[PDB]
């Protein structure tokens, strides 16, 4: 709570309205304080484009569409066109034409919502068409935490399966975990922890053999992998090119470079998509439907997804991806050169680094002391850096490597040193899950404290 | 209908080369010039709640300043964590939170629907953990939002809908009779969407408390009006945390809070309830992970607009806006009651459902549509409503409505069998079997997404 001193806190409505100009000044001052961290490339992920002109462009898209609520297609036909076109272009980018032109889907609020919708959809589809009432889903331990959210929300038993030596899903273990109640298996393309792409072709084949769904979580890779493939990088098919793939999520607000608050969920056929829709026919409020979880939605954010995709085009995504993967190549070579560190698996641009000899959490804390905001991992202990366009700016990768070399030297010199956040991550890694839940619950409460 | 089919190019695939930003903006701007008059000039029921150009420009600048905000990372955007904390605190205080003894707490959500879903899930989880209930039920009036059915279907809750009395308010005897040992929550609306009437919250809350179950007040529509209507001397029963048995309340900042679309608030009487809402993952290799609500990544700029709107209005601003809306409603209601063949359903303050026992109300509505009005068509029983906003408090707007409504009724009286445009559509939807409605609406959503 860094502003507790500098700015008044508001626990109650002001009696009189406060001047707009004063309100904007506070927000602008906070922006000046907060933006350097992501602008200058210190943040893993978080901001995916970050360019001044791109941002000013999407801000004006927002301004022009600010009143849009896609719950009312009759008032905002513009926004329904934008969502239809985002879905179509994304589907085409992800091998939709290979499905025979039946690929369809919706815009969502984010990768989490795309995953939740897909999970609910397989649940309802399986109940209706296979008589399954105690649904199960099989995913690798690396699959996003949102799969557990979906499981707990929709009453699906989540079975998480082990990874091989390369941190990719062990498909044999996935086959073993399938039962008559399994409704879907998933693979990540790539997974968030270690940036590796699961063996999608085998997972898709597994699913098809069992007549169950196969969801590919391409939230992180959907706007990168197709371009990496065209640039010559090693990437096997991960999308609708695979016969057994029945849905794919992809985040326009990650490497699509749209504004935060949008993603896409795609299904192989409409008969599947139809299980996602909510329709109420008996309500005194009249006919009511929604394609996704929300009722009212900020249509302006859909406009920003559409605008971003159109302003980039294939050549734009190709260039962005090129820059990111070149930076990644350079970063990975540097990490491999530093003694006592290793990279987990063989990632293209989301790089998890670990150490068998040193406390990786203190190496991470040493980086944080130099301004870096990296993601702390566990199982196993590691940190990761998800490279973005912010990291392709001049000097950024070199600063990272220089800082990391220094971090490692400092930790080797005092291997028992543990400061700042390092003991927090270490304790969290060792702690019983229930204890973690209690403490993190207290933490969320603290974020909401007004003093 | 898709108005831009022949006016602008359609995009089924990414352009090969990025298109100029300036052209993309021109196209979006052109669509805005086409679309804004309808809401700006007061023709839309609900839809746009403030709509003033200076207010809008103000929020658009709030968005610009916070555009990169993603509250999944409070360490990068402490500004936004502060905004959400203060939106919750101010809203809680406005809704009688101090009467709870200072234990009232909550979170910002993406909208009214998410607030309702979250409350529903929360009572389900709470009841499972503390009451051993594994086949949860919820009892709500038939007028309660369609979103209650979404929550029931998502989270495996049996939803029991109960009849209204002659004033279109919840029949509390029927709710009592519907309670079983598996019931986890009862709800009332403040006010309900269809007819704008406030349920007997005190009786419902007392019912709930007597049974040791939750009581959720859906104040999504009324939360930012009712407290001020009450201060102004209008007849409004207590409906909030002043009532002992009220355990949660939802209120929409993006409705009469005058924030931008994409925000709402869910409040709980105590932290031990709120804690059942949080998602926490402790064994994920992606590290410690938590979400206070459904989403992971979120558009923090939208929370900023809620906060800024609340601050720029203050109590005086909400009091003034509410006064204007309620006096416009008073005038509008009197004018409708003065028209021989029309009646208003129940006794609403500002969301007015109008019906007719003698004429086809759907054609009356169609005659209004031919004059530019975008009203909401209801059924059970047939009616239309107008949810009055600041847009309808502008000079001449209520007078135009009544003048148009008088001509509408004169025309229908002259040709009682006339049924044109959307009138036969609403008429058929009201008579049609729900399964048939489901199939047709499913086809309609498909139509929205056609490129
Ligand atoms: Na190394």
TrEMBL record, chain B:
Predominant location category: endoplasmic reticulum
Keyword terms, alphabetized: Endoplasmic reticulum, Lipid metabolism, Lyase, Membrane, Pyridoxal phosphate, Sphingolipid metabolism, Transmembrane, Transmembrane helix
- GO molecular function terms noted in the UniProt entry: aromatic-L-amino-acid decarboxylase activity; identical protein binding; pyridoxal phosphate binding; sphinganine-1-phosphate aldolase activity
Mark the residues carrying the PTM N6-(pyridoxal phosphate)lysine: 255
Cell compartment(s), UniProt: Endoplasmic reticulum membrane
Q: What PANTHER family does this protein's entry cite? A: PTHR42735, SPHINGOSINE-1-PHOSPHATE LYASE 1
Q: Which family does it belong to?
A: Belongs to the group II decarboxylase family. Sphingosine-1-phosphate lyase subfamily.
Name of the protein described by the UniProt record: Putative sphingosine-1-phosphate lyase
Q: What species does this protein belong to?
A: Symbiobacterium thermophilum (strain DSM 24528 / JCM 14929 / IAM 14863 / T)
